[PDB]
Ligand binder design. Structure first.
Ligand SMILES: Cc1cc2nc3c(=O)[nH]c(=O)nc-3n(C[C@H](O)[C@H](O)[C@H](O)COP(=O)(O)O)c2cc1C
Ligand SMILES: Cc1cc2nc3c(=O)[nH]c(=O)nc-3n(C[C@H](O)[C@H](O)[C@H](O)COP(=O)(O)O)c2cc1C
Ligand SMILES: [Cl-]
Ligand SMILES: [Cl-]
Ligand SMILES: [Cl-]
Ligand SMILES: [Zn+2]
Ligand SMILES: [Zn+2]
Ligand SMILES: [Zn+2]
Lengths: 396, 284, 20, 266, 266, 284, 284
């Protein structure tokens, strides 16, 4: 369904398609394929949200992978206020073997940004934002490992910022959980949500294997980052392990989105595997790594090393006194150095927005097997599990 | 009278930041925050009278206030009457259009001049749509027409050219209206090939970039009389769609749409054209 | 294929597949 | 399952114009057939009293002429097809063993390692799905409380589909004429996946898919006759209501025909 | 003949809007399939190299999941359906006795005084006609020079239809793929009479008529397997050209599917 | 249930004639004239007890009297428990229906309430047909009504509204029966009105629009008294078909389908629509 | 048969580029440059003997040279004996086609004659496609052409004409293949243009008109040079699809179908029509 096809020389991607499904209670899956300009973009959920999500995922990934042009070249201390420049320097000093002297005198390619709290306009290094190897090629020695953490696309700036904040919360929460093994609470694996498509997925997963659901929200933060985990020993199952993650203000909303994120990763990899596609078809190193984690030991390794702050397994999905504190206040207490990269483009009589929330006081990206700022305002080397500090989290 | 362009204001306590398609501005006057909050809720349209009232209520000089709103890209002042009083065709094949000016009057299309692209000293009047039609495409030809005429009052541009088996008609580029340009399409397309996650080593970008290096134009492939007659009619009808148009009773989507025609199947594909954030047409 | 006659710069793969 | 095809792969080739035109046409033949609409709707455009003249007749290539080449019935080695069952009665228990026999013989190869079926299909695409609906509490069940299943003819297995009660399913499948139908033990519902029927052959695939459905229920007629079940192919149902009750997504899949199975005694 | 129905009686109930809409749709699936158009047309929208992934597969109600109720193949009492014939060879003579056996067993009751058939039909209307096309001079004939006949399933008789030569018929039925087909002895052509399919049930009658066609060719598959004929159901023909060659009036009647019969040796 | 059908009973001198849709009778019995006159002054449904009483009072055998009344087309007897036990009309012009509840009883139509869309706290019972009629269309109104009532056991909806020069009555939306909703309908009509010569509505221009909050109004011609009267009759007859005294049976293939009327030519077109691919009504 | 496909071969300084629909090649061999230049100056079909000679003259291995030319999209080799061995164009505006025979050879289209409809004693050979193109339509002209040529062994017809704001090209009428004739087409379009909201064209008003001698003209917009050029290209491409150098294959379900073009929007719609119930083409 949909099935909009574009010529190779079109501005628009090769194919958009909404997949048919027999079961009215399964989520709709929509996908955009655009050769290997980017890897295919998809979303799942309610029909229209799935369509909107696939389009948004495509616009987002195309922007960060294919379309960034930098706005000049400046040193860190020319580019932003002094205490932001110092935090970047301390991030970059851990990422490469280069000296602080080399870091503070290097002229980085710049992109526009504003401080999340003060709205003070500045620039940040383009090398953090652009995913291609051309845009900020001469800065890659300082920051060789990039990814799309905190990236979002939407029709309004506030919605894009909200989307970026949610992803930032998700990934920072996931890395802390990965490194330390600490979660706030477990939600019952037999939980019933009342939402037909969520319960359909949960029942199917429970019948195929087993699940665990953890609230891994950054300690003291409002809202809820919910991590869903799946694993099976069943021989004829192609998916031995999968995961989903989502952050929202509502615990129920976060859990529902998390379940659908899991189903999405489960089914994409399942379809890759029954399609018989080769490893040469995988061009993304995070996707390659995730595929090599498709084994029951990923599930057991996570679950057996998880320690809960609360022993009581939650049977209901109510909020608590911390859930609705101010997220911006919470973040600012940790660090004033949180920035919003932004770009916008006219579409008819509207603007669409690309944003990325970036902080050198938090993890700059999610690959702790690569070159990462391991020492920051939420983690320091030796705090958590040693082997985890050199291994990438088993998450796509 | 006044089109309100899309924009955002973000506030944090007493800090306010305005972002338009072309600007990012710290808003520190209370009056201007109130003007912008009002315009943001109005949704595309306002009368000069209501804008003037809104400015007076917020204690902002009307002339300083409107110059700011126009310059930063919050509003544009455009006419109820037709945007373009006439059109000119600039081409590398001007002989194709040797009877178009006379013929197209009966379709209500008024083309005042056909101009050879090889002419040294091309002049174009105010409020004129410039149609640039090329059988031999090179990006520098479009760049030189843009540089010559972008500051002509009320000017707009449309380009037509050939890409393998397709004839493409770009959207309308209007500096006044702030619509995308030729390069918002083609340079963005080339960017996506160059910056592909995995480059296609047999990309058509290789041809286009090699033609730049070798100082060569991209020819239309084996056009005959019939392909040219087909192109001629498409040009006529597109011009007709742009005649008598303004923001008063013609949606911006008439301008921000391209038309591609497969010359083999004769099938037309009408597609949206959007701005590219990196384009130099936004440096303003 | 690479040839003695020149270097192939670009291919329209869809149309090549149909020249299925 | 070992033979799984994702519909994602299919939709890559879909022509959305073909799909829309086919669906538009298809829905013209859907019925609203419910007991509550009995006095305000009709099914036959011919009055009951004149239907006899149309039933079980031959139309001729040369009407009015009788020069034919007669063929002897001594070449016939076949059994008579049993009369279609009606006024079904579910007083006796019906085993899953009987239903399993129907399914594997009608739709599957005797060899479980083979992917050939006892009915052909254009391009070997097999766009028609068979669903099993349990309609009486006197029918034995595989999984307690599951009353709709999907038969996988290559795996030779049943996939659970729905836990609607037996009364809801019966109501949806039997349409307006449920009193005359009686109480069958179960039904088969044959469903077209639109995009699987259309993606290769375009419009002609629709025609091929409908013909395939007839080859399938015909195997079921023949197998049912051999195992002592009565059956009736049935078009008097409300298509959208059957789909909803089975939790089918009508954007993708539509019920073409229902086939009731059971006993006829009292 | 004793069972004759005049189409005059049928058209009295025809809704001309239904008829036109159905014909309009129907013709969207017709093909221009000729050897002379081989290099300028295509049939499959999927490239040959990718077709394997779609052939002989199962689509699942719960994709990605494998919890199923397995059924044993020990309940299967059936023979494997033979592979569909291809590269047909007509070197051996084929008797009218063999063709008569096919026809009476597939389409007629063993009792010549009965009007029931071995396949059911909505409203007992039987809107599908079977035509017999003689395709090789190695096929024996009933009437010298007549190569198209219409089978009357209740009379159990053949009505002469056309004296076109065997080569013209073969050309029309085999479409573009005649080299691969080879040389079958004969074909059955199943045709819908539009007004007979539509007059009672309206649009749903079209769907019923197409399904009925599949029940008919399926009986022919099964009977052909038992009498040592090979067969192939076939959609690769030019509908209007087949109709014209058989002298059918396309305003009334259209060929839905062709079925080739013969031997496969060399 | 005994339904009184349309008829007249007229008299002049010593002559009395019954005229129904089925027959005409020269009435020669005074008692039956009296019965027919009393039946003519009643609205739609009559208790069999009162019919019997009426016949007893005129000294007519009940069985013979009833047989006469049925065979001539004065009354009929129905047996069927109906699908919706009640109808409500929700509208932005409730005053158009201020006499509808009482008038439409004589067509056997039970409308319990006329509800103004402006009402907060609108309640509806089990197994109710909800007719939503809008002169001033906005998609948010339909969404509010669905949001409130889609879960009501046995509910169904009909929506009516104006588009260009047409009056549209959607097919019956019944979640229990799985039939297409209003949004399925309005997308079918919006697609057909586009001058694309294509059944398929999807392209990048449409995909980009689907990013915005789904909302819309509809252009339509200004309504006069006669358009409202025509609409009023179509509403009545449609309700009558579904829930009232059935006068003409509908074929099962089009009983729940949409009905569109061109307000200029007065021609009706009844058409089943498919579920719109991007609609979520099926998933709820 | 060797068909030369669309391409350009361009040169500047020491750089030479081949560009086809399939590929682009930086040409580094002087002999192959020479071959490509000679092929570019020829029209459509070339004898394999001359191709071989061309390759021999440039000292290129014939097999390797041919493989290069085929794989890059410069030539292809076809094997099939075609259904119509020749085409003729019969028209009331033969001057519109006065260069068509020579131009269209480079698209592989063999048109033997342009015939003025005013000619008495028009002859056509076996297995000829007859294209009848009318600016000034009258049904009697079509009837005359059918009356003269329907019995010609292997004949087929295509008819083209204008109706309202459209250019219509009928499906191929082949008596041998049993496909619908012009009258089948024109009745389908006349029915669709009636504002009846009905597919069915028959009523007593239509039956009474069918009593008169069947004849008609058709209303249409006045044609300019651009409409004629557009039409000219569509004719060429249609002939090319059927009898010429095939560049894009057609699906078998729409290869012989009608093609209609809206002259305002330039959108094409390709549609198979049914035999008209009142037409006798099937009976002939
Ligand atoms: C409706 C229908 C149309 C078919 N059309 C063709 C055809 O045009 N050409 C062909 O080679 N086979 C055709 N077949 C045969 C199928 O390709 C065949 O049944 C399938 O490949 C499975 O092979 P089998 O019959 O040998 O098991 C058709 C079958 C059906 C049911
Ligand atoms: C496609 C199809 C639909 C049918 N629908 C119905 C139906 O809705 N109601 C019914 O009583 N019988 C239905 N039948 C059964 C026929 O009425 C039956 O086959 C016919 O009357 C001949 O009777 P027999 O099967 O007992 O020989 C259907 C049969 C077919 C093939
Ligand atoms: Cl939330
Ligand atoms: Cl409310
Ligand atoms: Cl003559
Ligand atoms: Zn630009
Ligand atoms: Zn809907
Ligand atoms: Zn005709």
């Amino acid at each position: 369904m949909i099935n909009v096809y574009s010529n190779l020389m079109s501005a628009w991607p090769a194919t958009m398609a909404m997949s048919p499904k027999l079961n009215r209670n399964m989520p709709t899956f929509s996908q955009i394929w655009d050769y290997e300009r980017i890897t295919p973009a998809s979303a799942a959920g309610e029909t229209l949200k799935s369509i909107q999500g696939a389009i948004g995922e495509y616009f987002e990934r195309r922007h960060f992978f294919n379309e960034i042009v930098t706005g000049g070249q400046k040193t860190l201390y020319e580019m932003m206020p002094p205490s932001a420049a110092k935090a970047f320097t301390e991030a970059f000093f851990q990422i490469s073997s280069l000296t602080r002297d080399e870091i503070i005198t290097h002229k980085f390619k710049t992109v526009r940004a504003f401080n999340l709290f003060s709205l003070e306009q500045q620039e940040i290094p383009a090398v953090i934002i652009a995913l291609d190897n051309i845009t900020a090629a001469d800065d890659l020695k300082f920051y060789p490992d990039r990814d799309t953490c905190g990236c979002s696309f939407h029709g309004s700036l506030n919605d894009a910022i909200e989307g970026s904040l949610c992803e930032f919360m998700e990934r920072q929460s996931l890395l802390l959980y990965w490194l330390q093994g600490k979660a706030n609470t477990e939600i019952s694996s037999e939980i019933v949500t009342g939402i037909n498509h969520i319960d359909e997925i949960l029942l199917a997963l429970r019948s195929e294997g087993d699940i665990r659901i953890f609230d891994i929200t950054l300690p003291g933060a409002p809202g809820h980052a919910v991590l869903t985990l799946y694993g099976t020993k069943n021989k004829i199952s192609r998916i031995k392990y999968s995961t989903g993650l989502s952050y929202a203000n509502s615990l129920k909303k976060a859990l529902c989105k998390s379940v659908v994120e899991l189903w999405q990763s489960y089914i994409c990899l399942h379809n890759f595997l029954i399609g018989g596609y080769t490893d040469d078809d995988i061009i993304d190193s995070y996707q390659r790594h995730f595929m090599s984690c498709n084994k029951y030991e990923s599930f057991t390794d996570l679950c057996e090393n998880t320690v809960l702050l609360s022993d009581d397994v939650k049977l209901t999905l109510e909020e608590n006194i911390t859930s609705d504190t101010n997220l911006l206040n919470y973040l600012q207490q940790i660090s004033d150095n949180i920035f919003v990269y932004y770009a916008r483009e006219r579409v008819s009589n509207s603007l669409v927005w690309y944003t990325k929330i970036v902080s050198p006081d938090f993890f700059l990206h999610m690959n702790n097997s690569g070159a990462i700022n391991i020492n920051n305002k939420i983690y320091h080397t030796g705090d958590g599990i040693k082997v985890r500090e050199s291994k990438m989290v088993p998450f796509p | 009278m006044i089109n309100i362009l899309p924009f955002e204001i973000i506030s944090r306590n007493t800090k306010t930041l305005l972002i338009t398609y072309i600007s990012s501005v710290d808003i520190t006057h209370e009056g201007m925050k109130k003007v912008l909050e009002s315009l943001r809720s109005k949704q595309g349209i306002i009368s000069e009278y209501l804008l003037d009232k809104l400015l007076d209520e917020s204690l902002i000089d009307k002339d300083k206030g409107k110059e700011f709103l126009i310059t930063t890209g919050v509003i544009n002042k455009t006419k109820t009457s037709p945007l373009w009083v006439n059109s000119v065709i600039i081409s590398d094949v001007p002989h194709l259009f040797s009877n178009a000016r006379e013929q197209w009057k009966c379709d209500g299309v008024f083309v005042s001049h056909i101009i050879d692209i090889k002419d040294n000293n091309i002049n174009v009047s105010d409020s004129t749509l410039i149609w640039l039609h090329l059988e031999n495409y090179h990006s520098d030809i479009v760049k030189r027409i843009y540089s010559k005429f972008e500051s002509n009052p009320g000017v707009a541009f449309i380009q037509s050219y050939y890409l393998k088996e397709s004839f493409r008609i770009d959207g309308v580029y209007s500096p006044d209206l702030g619509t995308p340009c030729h390069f918002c399409h083609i340079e963005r397309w080339l960017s996506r090939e160059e910056k592909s996650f995995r480059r296609n080593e047999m990309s058509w970008a290789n041809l286009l970039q090699l033609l730049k290096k070798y100082q060569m134009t991209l020819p239309a492939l084996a056009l005959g009389e019939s392909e040219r007659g087909f192109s001629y009619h498409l040009i006529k009808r597109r011009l007709q769609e742009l005649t008598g148009t303004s923001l008063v009773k013609s949606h911006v989507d008439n301008f921000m749409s391209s038309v591609s025609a497969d010359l083999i199947t004769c099938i037309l594909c009408k597609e949206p054209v959007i701005h590219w954030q990196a384009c130099s047409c936004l440096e303003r | 294929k690479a040839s003695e006659f020149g270097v192939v710069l670009s291919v329209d793969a869809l149309k090549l597949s149909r020249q299925g | 399952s070992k033979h799984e095809l994702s519909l994602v792969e299919v939709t890559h080739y879909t022509d959305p114009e073909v799909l829309a035109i086919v669906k538009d046409f298809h829905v013209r033949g859907n019925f609203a057939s419910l007991p509550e609409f009995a006095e305000r709707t009709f099914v036959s455009a011919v009055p009951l009293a004149h239907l006899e003249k149309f039933e079980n007749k031959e139309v001729l290539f040369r009407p009015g002429f009788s020069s034919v080449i007669n063929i002897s019935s001594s070449h016939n080695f076949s059994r008579e097809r049993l009369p279609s069952g009606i006024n079904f009665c579910d007083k006796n228990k019906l085993s899953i063993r009987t239903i399993e026999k129907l399914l594997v013989n009608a739709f599957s190869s005797p060899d479980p390692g083979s992917v050939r079926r006892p009915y052909p299909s254009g391009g070997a695409l097999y766009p028609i799905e068979v669903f099993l609906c349990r309609l009486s509490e006197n029918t034995e069940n595989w999984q307690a409380g599951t009353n709709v299943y999907h038969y996988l003819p290559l795996s030779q297995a049943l996939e659970p589909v729905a836990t609607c009660n037996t009364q809801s399913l019966y109501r949806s499948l039997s349409g307006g004429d449920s009193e005359r139908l009686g109480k069958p033990h179960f039904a088969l519902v044959y469903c077209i996946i639109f995009e699987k029927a259309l993606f290769k052959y375009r419009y002609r695939g629709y025609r091929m898919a409908l013909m395939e459905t007839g080859s399938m229920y015909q195997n079921a007629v023949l197998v049912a006759d051999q195992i002592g079940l009565k059956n009736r192919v049935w078009a008097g149902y409300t298509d959208s209501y059957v789909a909803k009750t089975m939790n089918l997504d009508q954007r993708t899949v539509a019920p073409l025909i229902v086939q009731f199975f059971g006993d006829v005694n009292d």
